[PDB]
Amino acid sequence: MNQGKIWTVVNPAVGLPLLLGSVAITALLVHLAVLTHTTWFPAFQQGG
Amino acid sequence: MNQGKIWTVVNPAVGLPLLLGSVAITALLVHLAVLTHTTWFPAFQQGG
Amino acid sequence: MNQGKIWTVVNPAVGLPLLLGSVAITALLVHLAVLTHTTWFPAFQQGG
Amino acid sequence: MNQGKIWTVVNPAVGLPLLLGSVAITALLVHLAVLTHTTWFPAFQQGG
Amino acid sequence: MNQGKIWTVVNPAVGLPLLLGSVAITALLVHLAVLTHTTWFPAFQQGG
Amino acid sequence: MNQGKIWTVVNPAVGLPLLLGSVAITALLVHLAVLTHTTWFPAFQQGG
Amino acid sequence: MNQGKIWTVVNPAVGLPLLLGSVAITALLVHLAVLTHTTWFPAFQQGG
Amino acid sequence: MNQGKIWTVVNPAVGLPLLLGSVAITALLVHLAVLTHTTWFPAFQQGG
Amino acid sequence: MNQGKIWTVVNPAVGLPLLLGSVAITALLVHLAVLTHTTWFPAFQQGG
Amino acid sequence: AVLSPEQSEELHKYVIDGARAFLGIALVAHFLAFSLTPWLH
Amino acid sequence: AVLSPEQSEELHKYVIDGARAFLGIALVAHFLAFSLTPWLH
Amino acid sequence: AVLSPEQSEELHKYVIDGARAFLGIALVAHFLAFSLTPWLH
Amino acid sequence: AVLSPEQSEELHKYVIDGARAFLGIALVAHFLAFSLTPWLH
Amino acid sequence: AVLSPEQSEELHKYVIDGARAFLGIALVAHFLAFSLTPWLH
Amino acid sequence: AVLSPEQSEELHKYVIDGARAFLGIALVAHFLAFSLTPWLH
Amino acid sequence: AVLSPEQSEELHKYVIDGARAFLGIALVAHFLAFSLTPWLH
Amino acid sequence: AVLSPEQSEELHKYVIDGARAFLGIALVAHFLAFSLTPWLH
Amino acid sequence: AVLSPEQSEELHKYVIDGARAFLGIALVAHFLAFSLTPWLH
Numbered sequence A, B, C, D, E, F, G, H, I: 001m002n003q004g005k006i007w008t009v010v011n012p013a014v015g016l017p018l019l020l021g022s023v024a025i026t027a028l029l030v031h032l033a034v035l036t037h038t039t040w041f042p043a044f045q046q047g048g
Numbered sequence J, K, L, M, N, O, P, Q, R: 001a002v003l004s005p006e007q008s009e010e011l012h013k014y015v016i017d018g019a020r021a022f023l024g025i026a027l028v029a030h031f032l033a034f035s036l037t038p039w040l041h
């Protein structure tokens, strides 16, 4: 919130897609990591 | 729905293909994740 | 069919190859997924 | 055969290499898939 | 802190996204490495 | 041999490296496929 | 230290990010190699 | 040796790095293939 | 040492980073190959 | 290219209507998955 | 390059007719898969 | 393109409000995960 | 570059004749595979 | 684009303050890891 | 760059002669493989 | 862009001082690894 | 950039001499491999 | 950019001296590997 001069140096047309894309990739990697290292998330996917 | 000024900063000719392509890749990754961590989706593919 | 203004924003020389290429990649991924998770598609490939 | 106006929208210098390259990649993927899921194609490669 | 002339040689619009992206990738790789080589981080993810 | 007008549409400075590179990659993939699915090619490499 | 004319031939805006990025990638690869081929680095990560 | 007109069509600044790089990659792939499919090359690396 | 006219054809700003980067990648691949196919290099990393 | 503020708001209505149409189809697919699958059962 | 609004609508009719032709062939392939395969059986 | 100092501060308010909205949704998702999952239990 | 409507139709005849030639060779290869392989047998 | 020597030093103060803020948060996270984890224990 | 129709036909003769030379070497290599290998034997 | 011969030598002093600083930190890390690890022991 | 026909032939002599030098070193390496290795033995 | 014939020969002396320096260090590393390792032993 004090970093607001960064768009004078970084092009927001490149940096804002890079930010949103990095956040989305990170969320997929965390979900995959939890799916591969727990029994309860595969068991929730399985049901029955 | 309040983010509608984003096309003043991001080129929609780059960002709209990136949005639709990211959604399509995410849907494939979720389908693959469910196929690899359940017995009922491979059993539905198998039949008999 | 109501989305026909999209070629005013997306270049069709980039977007139409991306559409056809994404559909072709998706069809290969679905065929591979069915081949790897059924016994009847490898058995059809095997014969005898 | 009714799609012949597509070269007014897609550059044939990009699209014709993409078509021929996609067909060649698909043929390699199908050959690899048959090699990995049958015993008769590895046995034909082996001989004796 | 004595390297502050580097933005006379490196474009900060390329180098500052590369710095932040490299730090974020490194943090994901360290988290993945700890998850794959300990029993206590998968056990914390599992609970119960 | 009847396709000789293709260099009026495809740039030969891109297409001729793509042709030669695709042929070389295909030859490596076929050699690797034969090495991984026969006992006689690894036995020829081994000797003794 | 006698190679200081190299920035008359190589652009330092490309080459200095390539140098720092190559050093950082090499350090990650060495750390990963030591983690995967020793018992004491995974045991230090594990504790207890 | 009769192909010497090819540098009228292919840019030698792209094609000569591509040739040398392809030869170097091929030599690494052949060395790796021999290392992975013989016992005598790993035994030469091991010694004792 | 008789190849010194090559910088009249290849741009040294592209080719000299490609040379140094290829040598560095090759050295990492050889070190990894020796680490994965001997017991004495992992035993030197392990100690004790 | 990047748009005028008014043109951006006009484009974003199609993006939001497209996302609402995708959401609705996904809500029907999740209900069909609840009804036909051992998920949540 | 990007098109006029009228040229965009003319192009999108070929995209929609191409997707309808693909859908029809896929509907025949799914029916043939239902008839010849242990899927849904 | 890169912005004026004033335009940069105006854009960064939308980036910070977007990150605060993401944080709030993630705080509800973590509380729901604490309540419904064997995590921390 | 992109073509005139008439030049596009002239180019697409070579693309369609190339695809028909590929289809014919593939139909002979599939018949040879039916005759020489345990596939469909 | 690349900066003046004075503009470069002004930018690098924000890069160094950002790295010091990251270092401080990482020092708290490592202390919390020492206290809550079997690491170094 | 893309060629004149006459220049294209002149270039394609070298591409076709190169492919015929590759085909001939491959026909000798396949015969040597038939003679020296358990393939087709 | 590429530099004058004098500007190149001025830049390379910072590259060499940066590599010497990295080398020194790595020499302390290798000594700490010799002292705290079963390596060379 | 692409060369004159005469400049192309002058460059290709260095490419062919480089490939002949590589071939000769590879012929010595294959003979050394025949002599020192269980290959062909 | 690409160089004059004289400038190319001046640059290639630094490339050849760099490769000779790399070769010498590699010859010492291979001798140290022969002396300290079970390789060739």
Ligand code: BCL
Pocket: A020, B001, B002, B003, B006, B019, J015, J016, J019, J020, J026, J027, J030, L017, L018, L019, L021, L025
């Ligand atoms: C929250 C406060 C603001 C807001 C702030 C922001 C911000 C900030 C951003 C967006 C962005 C987006 N917003 Mg929004 N947005 C708002 C309201 C909306 C509405 C609406 C109410 O109709 C729509 C359709 C959208 C649509 C969009 C997308 C076009 C885009 C990407 C979102 C994403 O990936 O979400 C992923 C989804 C979620 C995080 C929500 C979680 C899942 C939902 C709630 C439920 C799914 C149910 C499922 C089908 C069934 C599961 C059943 C099980 C039993 C649980 N917004 C409100 C007014 N919006 C982003 C952007 O512009 O990208 C380019 C962006 O950065």
Ligand SMILES: CC(C)=CCC/C(C)=C/C=C/C(C)=C/C=C/C(C)=C/C=C/C=C(C)/C=C/C=C(C)/C=C/C=C(\C)CCCC(C)(C)O
Pocket: A027, A028, A029, A031, A032, A035, B023, B026, B029, B030, B033, C002, C003, C004, C005, C006, C008, C009, J010, J011, J014, J015, J016, J018, J019, J022
């Ligand atoms: C298990 C694991 C690992 C992970 C699990 C799961 C996981 C993480 C899931 C995450 C899922 C997420 C995040 C999903 C998000 C989905 C979203 C946001 C979907 C959005 C869809 C948007 C659409 C379809 C937009 C269409 C736009 C359109 C059609 C736009 C049209 C525009 C036009 C016509 C231009 C008009 C201009 C003129 C000036 C002419 O008027």
Ligand SMILES: CC(C)=CCC/C(C)=C/C=C/C(C)=C/C=C/C(C)=C/C=C/C=C(C)/C=C/C=C(C)/C=C/C=C(\C)CCCC(C)(C)O
Pocket: B027, B028, B029, B031, B032, B035, C023, C026, C029, C030, C033, D002, D003, D004, D005, D006, D008, D009, K010, K011, K014, K015, K016, K018, K019, K022
């Ligand atoms: C198991 C897992 C993991 C996953 C499982 C499954 C899974 C997720 C599946 C998902 C599947 C999905 C989403 C499928 C979607 C398929 C779609 C949308 C197909 C669309 C096809 C479109 C076509 C063919 C378009 C052709 C256009 C054409 C030919 C256009 C021609 C244009 C012309 C001639 C220009 C004229 C211009 C002038 C001005 C001259 O008139």
Ligand SMILES: CC(C)=CCC/C(C)=C/C=C/C(C)=C/C=C/C(C)=C/C=C/C=C(C)/C=C/C=C(C)/C=C/C=C(\C)CCCC(C)(C)O
Pocket: A023, A026, A029, A030, A033, B002, B003, B004, B005, B006, B008, B009, E027, E028, E029, E031, E032, E035, L010, L011, L014, L015, L016, L018, L019, L022
């Ligand atoms: C287990 C392992 C391996 C790892 C585990 C975990 C791990 C490492 C996790 C790490 C997680 C991290 C770091 C998460 C970080 C998350 C962050 C930072 C989220 C940020 C979200 C930001 C958003 C959503 C921004 C939206 C911006 C927006 C919408 C901007 C809109 C702008 C507009 C409209 C322009 C207006 C301009 C005009 C001039 C017209 O006013």
Ligand SMILES: CC(C)=CCC/C(C)=C/C=C/C(C)=C/C=C/C(C)=C/C=C/C=C(C)/C=C/C=C(C)/C=C/C=C(\C)CCCC(C)(C)O
Pocket: C027, C028, C029, C031, C032, C035, D023, D026, D029, D030, D033, F002, F003, F004, F005, F006, F008, F009, M010, M011, M014, M015, M016, M018, M019, M022
């Ligand atoms: C098991 C799994 C996973 C998957 C399994 C299987 C699976 C999914 C399979 C899918 C297969 C598919 C989709 C196959 C599709 C194959 C197709 C469409 C082949 C098309 C071939 C086209 C060709 C060869 C075109 C040649 C064009 C040519 C030569 C053009 C020449 C042009 C010229 C000379 C320019 C003249 C201009 C001037 C103005 C001078 O006249």
Ligand SMILES: CC(C)=CCC/C(C)=C/C=C/C(C)=C/C=C/C(C)=C/C=C/C=C(C)/C=C/C=C(C)/C=C/C=C(\C)CCCC(C)(C)O
Pocket: A002, A003, A004, A005, A006, A008, A009, E023, E026, E029, E030, E033, G027, G028, G029, G031, G032, G035, N010, N011, N014, N015, N016, N018, N019, N022
């Ligand atoms: C187990 C294994 C394999 C490996 C294990 C571990 C391993 C190797 C670890 C290695 C870790 C390493 C190396 C970590 C290094 C971390 C570092 C260096 C972090 C740096 C963070 C920097 C930041 C956050 C910078 C923010 C800058 C900022 C926000 C800049 C803002 C600028 C502005 C606003 C512009 C103002 C301009 C105007 C003219 C307008 O004033």
Ligand SMILES: CC(C)=CCC/C(C)=C/C=C/C(C)=C/C=C/C(C)=C/C=C/C=C(C)/C=C/C=C(C)/C=C/C=C(\C)CCCC(C)(C)O
Pocket: D027, D028, D029, D031, D032, D035, F023, F026, F029, F030, F033, H002, H003, H004, H005, H006, H008, H009, O010, O011, O014, O015, O016, O018, O019, O022
């Ligand atoms: C088991 C599995 C998975 C798969 C298994 C197998 C599988 C799928 C195999 C598929 C194999 C395929 C498809 C092979 C195809 C091979 C082909 C087509 C080879 C073609 C070679 C072409 C060459 C060598 C061309 C040389 C051109 C040349 C030298 C051109 C020179 C030009 C000049 C000098 C310019 C003069 C201009 C001036 C105006 C000055 O006269």
Ligand SMILES: CC(C)=CCC/C(C)=C/C=C/C(C)=C/C=C/C(C)=C/C=C/C=C(C)/C=C/C=C(C)/C=C/C=C(\C)CCCC(C)(C)O
Pocket: E002, E003, E004, E005, E006, E008, E009, G023, G026, G029, G030, G033, I027, I028, I029, I031, I032, I035, P010, P011, P014, P015, P016, P018, P019, P022
């Ligand atoms: C087990 C396996 C597989 C492999 C195992 C191991 C293996 C192979 C290891 C190999 C390791 C190698 C090779 C390591 C090499 C490490 C090196 C070379 C490190 C170099 C560090 C250099 C630095 C940090 C440079 C900083 C430069 C800087 C900061 C420059 C600053 C410049 C400025 C401020 C511009 C001023 C301009 C103005 C005109 C204004 O004055």
Ligand SMILES: CC(C)=CCC/C(C)=C/C=C/C(C)=C/C=C/C(C)=C/C=C/C=C(C)/C=C/C=C(C)/C=C/C=C(\C)CCCC(C)(C)O
Pocket: F027, F028, F029, F031, F032, F035, H023, H026, H029, H030, H033, I002, I003, I004, I005, I006, I008, I009, Q010, Q011, Q014, Q015, Q016, Q018, Q019, Q022
């Ligand atoms: C087991 C498996 C999977 C596979 C197994 C095996 C497998 C497939 C193997 C395949 C191997 C193949 C195909 C190998 C091919 C090797 C080749 C072709 C080597 C060629 C080397 C060429 C060289 C070194 C060229 C140097 C050129 C040079 C130095 C040029 C210098 C030019 C200059 C100085 C410019 C002067 C200009 C001025 C106007 C000033 O005079």
Ligand SMILES: CC(C)=CCC/C(C)=C/C=C/C(C)=C/C=C/C(C)=C/C=C/C=C(C)/C=C/C=C(C)/C=C/C=C(\C)CCCC(C)(C)O
Pocket: G002, G003, G004, G005, G006, G008, G009, H027, H028, H029, H031, H032, H035, I023, I026, I029, I030, I033, R010, R011, R014, R015, R016, R018, R019, R022
């Ligand atoms: C087990 C398996 C799979 C494989 C196993 C093994 C395998 C295949 C190995 C293969 C290994 C190979 C091939 C190794 C080759 C190594 C080579 C060639 C090393 C070359 C090093 C070159 C260097 C270091 C060059 C430095 C240049 C320099 C510093 C240049 C400086 C220039 C300047 C200052 C510009 C002055 C301009 C002005 C006009 C101002 O004077």
Ligand SMILES: CCCCCCCCCCCCO[C@@H]1O[C@H](CO)[C@@H](O[C@H]2O[C@H](CO)[C@@H](O)[C@H](O)[C@H]2O)[C@H](O)[C@H]1O
Pocket: D048, F039, F040, F041, F043, F044, F047, O029, O032, O033, O036, O037, O038
């Ligand atoms: C320009 C390209 C040139 C391409 C050249 C193509 C021809 C290559 C000829 C390679 C000859 C390999 O010859 C082949 O060697 C192997 C190993 O000795 C033999 O292998 C034999 O014993 C091994 C065990 O040791 C068994 O696994 C194998 O089933 C059996 O056939 C084959 O019976 C022989 O046919």
Ligand SMILES: CCCCCCCCCCCC[N+](C)(C)[O-]
Pocket: A013, A014, A017, A018, A021, A022, A025, B011, B014
């Ligand atoms: C996590 C990866 C996300 C990739 C995002 C890539 C954004 C590229 C933006 C290019 C903008 C180009 N242009 C001409 C509009 O300035």
Ligand SMILES: CCCCCCCCCCCC[N+](C)(C)[O-]
Pocket: B013, B014, B017, B018, B021, B022, B025, C011, C014
């Ligand atoms: C999920 C990945 C999707 C990739 C989408 C890539 C879109 C690139 C758009 C380039 C537009 C170029 N141009 C010249 C028309 O502005």
Ligand SMILES: CCCCCCCCCCCC[N+](C)(C)[O-]
Pocket: C013, C014, C017, C018, C021, C022, C025, D011, D014
């Ligand atoms: C699924 C991946 C498909 C990739 C398709 C890539 C299309 C690139 C089109 C570039 C068009 C360039 N130009 C100059 C003609 O506008």
Ligand SMILES: CCCCCCCCCCCC[N+](C)(C)[O-]
Pocket: D013, D014, D017, D018, D021, D022, D025, F011, F014
């Ligand atoms: C299956 C992948 C095939 C990749 C084909 C890539 C074709 C690129 C063509 C670039 C044409 C550039 N130019 C300047 C001649 O218009």
Ligand SMILES: CCCCCCCCCCCC[N+](C)(C)[O-]
Pocket: A011, A014, E013, E014, E017, E018, E021, E022, E025
């Ligand atoms: C760790 C990988 C991070 C990738 C970061 C890539 C940044 C690219 C910036 C391009 C800037 C282009 N432009 C035209 C604004 O100068």
